Motif scaffolding. Structure first.
Motif, PDB file in Angstrom:
ATOM      1  N   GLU A  83       0.914  -1.242  -0.065  1.00 53.98           N
ATOM      2  CA  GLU A  83       0.051  -0.077   0.273  1.00 53.98           C
ATOM      3  C   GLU A  83       1.085   1.202  -0.144  1.00 53.98           C
ATOM      4  O   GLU A  83       1.983   1.282   0.081  1.00 53.98           O
ATOM      5  N   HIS A  84       0.453   2.503  -0.074  1.00 58.04           N
ATOM      6  CA  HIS A  84       1.169   3.782   0.060  1.00 58.04           C
ATOM      7  C   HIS A  84       2.000   4.017  -1.231  1.00 58.04           C
ATOM      8  O   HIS A  84       3.156   4.440  -1.188  1.00 58.04           O
ATOM      9  N   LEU A  85       1.302   3.568  -2.388  1.00 56.18           N
ATOM     10  CA  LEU A  85       2.126   3.733  -3.893  1.00 56.18           C
ATOM     11  C   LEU A  85       1.605   5.050  -4.445  1.00 56.18           C
ATOM     12  O   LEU A  85       0.429   5.633  -4.055  1.00 56.18           O
ATOM     13  N   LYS A  86       2.473   5.455  -5.354  1.00 54.70           N
ATOM     14  CA  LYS A  86       2.042   6.398  -6.335  1.00 54.70           C
ATOM     15  C   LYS A  86       0.806   6.328  -7.043  1.00 54.70           C
ATOM     16  O   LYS A  86       0.120   7.495  -7.309  1.00 54.70           O
ATOM     17  N   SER A  87       0.209   5.334  -7.483  1.00 54.88           N
ATOM     18  CA  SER A  87      -1.207   4.976  -8.059  1.00 54.88           C
ATOM     19  C   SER A  87      -1.901   3.735  -7.277  1.00 54.88           C
ATOM     20  O   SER A  87      -0.955   2.852  -6.772  1.00 54.88           O
ATOM     21  N   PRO A  88      -3.164   3.785  -7.410  1.00 58.52           N
ATOM     22  CA  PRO A  88      -3.958   2.677  -6.454  1.00 58.52           C
ATOM     23  C   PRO A  88      -3.863   1.266  -7.054  1.00 58.52           C
ATOM     24  O   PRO A  88      -3.903   0.536  -6.294  1.00 58.52           O
TER      25      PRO A  88
END
Length: 242
Positions: free
Chosen positions: A169-174
């Protein structure tokens, strides 16, 4: 910053578990290592160390380095990058980040790659039959790798069912937040246990991970993952505490 302390002086020198990290694969048995940061510089080779005794827990330290050799009394800066040093509770690990490096034909060119690798996972563990087979253990950690070094994961292991699981989780895109393939205890550890499972990439691909439990009572978990892709392989380091 205590970076300068750890290059100019040793830390807690008693070491009976972990107060340091071993460098015997970070450098060749013949080659020269220079490290530097924040007013200090370390100069070594063959098989040395880096000391971590009186530093904080559960954080990353930042360093400039180069791996080199002397040829006929002449000095060439063969490969340079980032020495990324994780300090935790009962455990510590290094990772490599080689970028700006010389071409071995013209003795004065540069090349810019972006090559990450995992390092040595320090902290001896020798005691799973010493834990209870009860509860659910929550864990949360940093992910650090060749495209991954901005995100962080959630991890769990049902002590009452002997099954691990997680999520990135906590990425640049979902779409980049991926499920983690739930995994049971499997043989590998010389007198300790392991959880080893599979890693799904951008809702595609086929990666792989392995990690172990640390401390005197499941205080933290550490190890490695390698996700292999059409871009080649990203190594990711694990750093997660109770």
């Amino acid at each position: 910053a205590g970076l300068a302390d750890a290059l100019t002086a040793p830390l807690d020198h008693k070491d009976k578990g972990l107060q340091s990290l071993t460098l015997d694969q970070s450098v060749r048995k013949n080659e020269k290592l220079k490290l530097a940061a924040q007013g200090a510089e370390k100069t070594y080779g063959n098989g040395d160390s880096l000391n971590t005794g009186k530093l904080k827990n559960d954080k990353v330290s930042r360093f400039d380095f180069i791996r080199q050799i002397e040829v006929d009394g002449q000095l060439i800066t063969l490969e340079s990058g980032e020495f990324q040093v994780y300090k935790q509770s009962h455990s510590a690990l290094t990772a490599f980040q080689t970028e700006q490096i010389q071409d071995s034909e013209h003795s004065g060119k540069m090349v810019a790659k972006r090559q990450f690798r995992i390092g040595d996972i320090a902290g001896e563990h020798t005691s799973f039959d010493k834990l209870p087979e009860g509860g659910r253990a929550t864990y949360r950690g940093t992910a650090f790798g060749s495209d991954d070094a901005g995100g962080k994961l959630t991890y769990t292991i049902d002590f009452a069912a002997k099954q691990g699981n997680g999520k990135i989780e906590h990425l640049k895109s979902p779409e980049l937040n991926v499920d983690l393939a739930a995994a049971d205890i499997k043989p590998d550890g010389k007198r300790h246990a392991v959880i080893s499972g599979s890693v799904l990439y951008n809702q595609a691909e086929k990666g792989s991970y392995s990690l172990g439990i640390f401390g005197g009572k499941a205080q933290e978990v550490a190890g490695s993952a390698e996700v292999k892709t059409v871009n080649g392989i990203r190594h990711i380091g694990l750093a997660a505490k109770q």
